[PDB]
Amino acid sequence: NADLSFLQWIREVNEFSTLPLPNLRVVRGTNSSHALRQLRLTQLTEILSGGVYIEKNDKLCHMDTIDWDNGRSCPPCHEVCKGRCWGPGSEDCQTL
Amino acid sequence: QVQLQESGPGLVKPSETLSLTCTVSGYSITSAYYWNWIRQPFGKGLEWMGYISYDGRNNFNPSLKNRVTISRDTSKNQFSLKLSSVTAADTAVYYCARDGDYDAFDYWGQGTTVTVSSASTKGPSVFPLAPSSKSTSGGTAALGCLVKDYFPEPVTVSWNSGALTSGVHTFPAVLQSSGLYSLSSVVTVPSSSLGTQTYICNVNHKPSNTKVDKKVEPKS
Amino acid sequence: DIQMTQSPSSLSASVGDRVTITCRASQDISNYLNWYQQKPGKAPKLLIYYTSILHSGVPSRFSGSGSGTDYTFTISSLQPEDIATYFCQQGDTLPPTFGGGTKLEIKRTVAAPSVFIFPPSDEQLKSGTASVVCLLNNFYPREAKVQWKVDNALQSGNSQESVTEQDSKDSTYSLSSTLTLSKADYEKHKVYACEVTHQGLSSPVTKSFNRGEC
Questions:
Q1: In this structure, are C158 and C189 located in the same domain?
Q2: Are strands A38-40 and A18-20 parallel, antiparallel or unpaired?
Q3: Which family does it belong to (chain A)?
Q4: For chain C, how far is it from start to end, CA to CA, in angstroms?
Q5: Comparing C-alpha atoms, which of B154, B172, B184 is closest to residue C163?
Q6: H helix or E strand, kind and range, residue C122
Q7: Which domain-ending residue is among C106, C130, C151?
Q8: CA distance A61 to chain B (A)
Q9: Do B103 and C50 lie within an 8 Å CB cutoff?
Q10: If you write DSSP's letter for every residue of B76-104 in order, what string do you get?
Q11: Counting C-beta atoms within 10 Å of the first and last residue's C-beta, which end of chain C has fewer, N or C?
Q12: Does one domain contain both C99 and C152?
């Protein structure tokens, strides 16, 4: 919805559709008829402590199928992607 | 297996309220999905009234304000769309469809034709566009049914109850001078098959209760 | 507010050739763009969702591209089963508005229409007005002219024309011309003829029927 491209270069540590972040790999973390639908953390292989409390975004797809109430009508992951996907495409998988 | 299907009256006066009901025969309705209503004017694009989620929300598409309403029953899987005070511009094909987040529409149902005017239901008259041996093109001939003087646009024409569909041509209904419509549906068959295989046309008028199984035979 | 354009609009193209239908959004954000294929008289069917990603059961022939606003529906090798109207979509706002609809017509070779004539039925004589019908079948360039000859006289304003869409079997057209008569003026003439001109015909085709044998 807005211009937020100046964070794809963030590697270490809101009404729009996608939260693009394909270059963030390590985290330590010490109406609503048109909302966010894609958590774009494609290259996320080390969450350290889980601490995952993201819930009830009402449209967030591909969060139940990611192995570490959000979206109940979602498209399937790529069958080559074997059901661990951050998105609908082959390059949107997970490794853990 | 998910399937959607719509039912309702054909015509609606600009004083009354048009009601349409979408039912999901695939038994796929959960407290998960969004089910929405889509409009197609003849020779135009696709509008979109609104959806009803599992909880249920108010009207959408601010253009259709205080006119589009959606209801839920949860007993026999009914979603009723009501558009009130139709303004004669709603002569369109209506679709009930499913929803999601990425791929917006999945099955679309089938769609019902609604024409808004003050005219009354007239009902179809079916006449046989009979073949003959002089106008036929060699080993191939044509035979048809001409349906006449019906105002409600949706007319369903089938041949041999769907036994043959290849070679059938159902031209769009033509709007005659006196408000009513008419069309012809012609099938091209081999010339040896004219008198041996019996051709009957199925003309169904959903707004009325008219179902004509009219046989097409060569003129005597 | 919201607007959505499909550029090629009418589009001819032959069987087995790349076809690009360019979409646009007028919205800075439309990452989620879906491509539908609506056959004539049928409900729209999903082909592509979310830009590139193809939907289940859709042939891999169809593909999508584009990032910001300029989107592109590509067919690698068009086949006669693709003559449907191709629509766009967006998801970023409350209304999921579609495109204007890019009509795809296959540009096949030229075929001469086959012409048939059908006299009014004996039943409609009872109804008090008769209708003759002219049929043109399986001709590619939509363009065709049909004229009515009654006692070798041209009349206008009493005939209506309707034309089908491209069938998927051979990407051809069919046309029906109806000539409406009252009972008074139908019985006073002997011969009714249909003259058909098409760019694939060297000379106009004549199909006529007279009384007596009817």
A1: yes
A2: parallel
A3: Belongs to the protein kinase superfamily. Tyr protein kinase family. EGF receptor subfamily.
A4: 63
A5: B172
A6: helix C122-126
A7: C106
A8: 7
A9: yes
A10: S-EEEEEEES--S---EEEEEEE--SSS-
A11: N
A12: no
Using the structure block, give the residue that is written with the tokens 């001078």.
B177
Does an H or E element contain B209, and which? Answer: none
Enter the resolution in angstroms: 2.9
For B151, list phi and psi in degrees, rounded to 5.
-85, -50
Tell me the technique behind this structure. Answer: cryo-EM
Query: d(Cα C24, Cα C47) in Å, to the nearest integer?
Result: 18
| Phi and psi torsions of C126, nearest 5° | -65, -35
Cβ neighbours of residue C129 closer than 8 Å, sequence gap 6 or more:
C180, C181, C182, C183
For each of the domains in chain A, give its residue range(s) and CATH number, in order of start.
Answer: 1-96 (3.80.20.20)
CATH match of B125-216 with 2.60.40.10: yes
CATH 2.60.40.10 fits B4-116, yes or no: yes
CB within 8 Å: B31 and A75: no
Tokens of C99: 């495109």
Which two structure tokens, joined as six digits, stand for B95?
A: 């679709």
Restricting to B residues 102-131, those with a Cβ less than 8 Å away from any Cβ of C are 102-106, 108-111, 125, 127-131
